[PDB]
Amino acid sequence: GPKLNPQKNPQKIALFGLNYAGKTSILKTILYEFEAFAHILDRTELDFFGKSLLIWDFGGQSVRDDYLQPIRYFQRIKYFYYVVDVQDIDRIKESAEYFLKLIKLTTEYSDDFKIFIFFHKIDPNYRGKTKFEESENRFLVEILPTINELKFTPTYFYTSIYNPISVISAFSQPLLGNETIYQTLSDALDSFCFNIDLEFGLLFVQNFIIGSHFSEPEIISKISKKMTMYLEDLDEFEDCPPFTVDPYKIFTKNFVISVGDNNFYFHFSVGINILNIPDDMDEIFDAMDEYTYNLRKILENSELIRTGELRNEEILSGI
Numbered sequence: 001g002p003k004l005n006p007q008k009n010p011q012k013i014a015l016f017g018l019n020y021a022g023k024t025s026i027l028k029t030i031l032y033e034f035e036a037f038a039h040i041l042d043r044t045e046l047d048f049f050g051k052s053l054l055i056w057d058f059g060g061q062s063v064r065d066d067y068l069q070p071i072r073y074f075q076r077i078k079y080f081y082y083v084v085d086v087q088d089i090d091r092i093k094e095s096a097e098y099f100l101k102l103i104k105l106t107t108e109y110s111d112d113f114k115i116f117i118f119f120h121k122i123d124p125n126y127r128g129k130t131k132f133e134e135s136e137n138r139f140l141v142e143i144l145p146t147i148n149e150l151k152f153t154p155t156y157f158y159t160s161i162y163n164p165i166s167v168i169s170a171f172s173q174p175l176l177g178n179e180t181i182y183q184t185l186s187d188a189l190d191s192f193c194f195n196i197d198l199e200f201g202l203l204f205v206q207n208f209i210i211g212s213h214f215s216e217p218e219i220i221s222k223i224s225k226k227m228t229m230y231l232e233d234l235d236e237f238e239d240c241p242p243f244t245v246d247p248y249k250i251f252t253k254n255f256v257i258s259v260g261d262n263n264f265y266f267h268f269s270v271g272i273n274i275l276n277i278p279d280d281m282d283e284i285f286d287a288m289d290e291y292t293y294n295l296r297k298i299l300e301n302s303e304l305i306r307t308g309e310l311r312n313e314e315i316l317s318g319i
């Protein structure tokens with residue numbers, strides 16, 4: 001997948017937890033499903049879908065607290081993903097202790113992030129439910145008084161790598177809620193355009209813009225209006241022809257997610273400057289095709305698709 005623009009400061013997803021909690025396994029699930037979104041050089045840092053991922057272990061019996069690391073690592077955190085092995089009840093108190101330490105550190109250096117707890121290794125159809133619940137409740141007993149004092153509202157997920165949709169849904173749903181989807185898609189488009197030297201990129205659903213990136217902001221209104229008119233003249237389920245908005249040529253791919261009897265029609269559009277046409281247009285088309293396939297897949301996790309409701313004002317307020 002595409003690199004992030006190194007002159008830019010992406011938002012971070014922190015994937016934290018005790019050693020053995022399952023985080024590398026969770027990461028690899030995402031990477032096997034969405035390699036097209038990942039810049040792949042055990043890795044502790046990688047770029048994914050317009051975000052920077054930080055995957056760090058804590059605790060255990062080795063000489064365990066090596067995070068107390070430069071301050072830059074706790075800056076720009078927007079998503080705090082914390083993995084808790086609920087089979088390992090004896091380590092739950094240790095897990096909660098690091099959780100609280102890391103939340104306090106993150107609050108010191110990052111201003112506005114949200115918390116997602118992955119209650120992990122809840123393997124499908126298998127006994128163990130009493131222990132799983134006891135571990136989850138013990139974790140919450142340890143962490144909620146502090147969370148409540150700090151006025152967080154964490155989200156709880158229930159995951160297992162042996163049921164990979166649970167992991168894919170937990171990891172992707174936070175990025176694609178109505179409050180975060182526009183920024184997520186916009187940052188993903190920025191990375192996509194940077195990686196192959198495109199001028200701008202837009203994503204639409206039902207002809208409404210849900211993500212946008214422009215290397216020149218002066219043209220946003222003009223291109224957005226022209227794209228709206230172009231899309232409103234297109235029929236369902238045909239290739240979208242290229243067109244020119246001088247000096248740009250714009251290429252569009254369409255994709256669809258059905259929810260019951262209803263379709264959500266999406267469009268992915270990117271622009272090149274005709275006065276500097278890339279030497280390898282095939283590379284751009286092949287990249288767009290692969291990206292579109294994976295965008296369709298990850299957007300199955302958006303609140304839009306999960307509820308079957310396009311809430312324009314909520315998406316615009318999320319910005």
Ligand SMILES: Nc1nc2c(ncn2[C@@H]2O[C@H](COP(=O)(O)OP(=O)(O)O)[C@@H](O)[C@H]2O)c(=O)[nH]1
Pocket residue numbers: 017018019020021022023024025026057120121122123159160161162
């Ligand atoms: N039963 C079960 N084992 C898992 C699960 N996820 C990870 N593991 C196992 O837990 C061990 C630690 O996983 P790992 O991904 O290396 O954890 P990390 O130390 O947090 O990176 C490994 O043996 C994994 O195969 C899961 O969902 N269910």
Ligand SMILES: [Mg+2]
Pocket residue numbers: 023024025042057
């Ligand atoms: Mg690991």
